[PDB]
Design a binder for these strands. Sequence first.
DNA 1: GGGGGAAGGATT
DNA 2: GAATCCTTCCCCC
Length: 342
Amino acid sequence: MIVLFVDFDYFYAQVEEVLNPSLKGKPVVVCVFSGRFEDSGAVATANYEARKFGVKAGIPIVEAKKILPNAVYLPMRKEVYQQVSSRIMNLLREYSEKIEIASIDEAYLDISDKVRDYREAYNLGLEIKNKILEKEKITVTVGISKNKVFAKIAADMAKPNGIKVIDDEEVKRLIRELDIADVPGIGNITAEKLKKLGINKLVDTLSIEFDKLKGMIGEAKAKYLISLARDEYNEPIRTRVRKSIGRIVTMKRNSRNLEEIKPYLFRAIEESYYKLDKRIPKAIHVVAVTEDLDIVSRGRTFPHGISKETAYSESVKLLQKILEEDERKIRRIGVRFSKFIE
DNA sequence: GGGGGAAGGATT
DNA sequence: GAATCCTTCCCCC
Ligand SMILES: Nc1ccn([C@H]2C[C@H](O)[C@@H](COP(=O)(O)OP(=O)(O)OP(=O)(O)O)O2)c(=O)n1
Ligand SMILES: *P(=O)(O)OC[C@@H]1CC[C@H](n2ccc(N)nc2=O)O1
Ligand SMILES: [Mg+2]
Ligand SMILES: [Mg+2]
């Protein structure tokens, strides 16, 4: 089994770059402006020029403008990015039908039946980068290894516009030396608590009693890390669809008033049914964000499809429940749709 | 005993 | 901040 993983370089910022020639060699920061106070919101993506001075995804915009005030700041245009992404993934499909589109900026190809060894895979990867650059002017990084996780790790390593093979000797070395925080699917909440116990490398995961590990990070992550350190991670490359679509918006202050909150909620529904195409969800969640970092939701699932008009009524009810079962005022309001037909 | 569903939590 | 996916828990056949 040979896996070829493809990840798009600083993707939202790079698409803005391709579109706007007046930008490339400068620092570029793609943001989501919550539209509240001036410069309210966060950084979604920054190019490498911007990253050098500390500005990266998830930091507050006002923070990015202190450590790098003169950069070019741009609002997120997710639909533009999604159009480009869709085109590149159709390019990817041509190299393998065994493809796992994991997110808007990355995918896994099972190229086992296509190539006989890592040398041929590396040439294939080069051909893939070349065609994506040619057709879309977008640089990508390719990872190649024996399974999905290590192929991504290879891409993580290959910096931007790179390509890298992690062979079998290399996985063994990586199991012992790679930081747990560098493992796909392991975020900082998980990395930090493990690190306090001295669990810093994948191999350490074997040194700790399974039951303690499961009590810390949960059964799934435990087994996941353990399977990695044991060099027996399986999981084939399979077709993936987006499971949920939704809209969450920030309100201009506001509070508890129903008829005040309702107009935002309604817009989020419009946008969510817009983005759903002709998918048809069976479940709906209304999500509100309180006056703190507190996120509260209420949902309902039906034995059938939810018509858009029906989305309206149910979503108000769900909101009524949130308002009734929580005293804090509401800052942001949204809706998520899931459990689609087929 | 194991879906399924709901509510909260974590990752990108 | 926004979008999405993951984790835990409850209940009933
Ligand atoms: N706190 C965070 C972390 C990440 N993201 C988004 C930004 C990224 O565009 C996207 C995917 O993460 P990537 O690490 O792949 O980021 P980039 O594609 O922008 O750059 P790179 O390819 O170097 O990873 O997740 C976000 O919105 N908020
Ligand atoms: P990123 O570094 O570009 O990685 C994206 C991947 C796609 C799926 C997966 N993912 C997404 C969202 C959540 N909550 N959990 C995940 O594991 O990361
Ligand atoms: Mg990327
Ligand atoms: Mg990515």
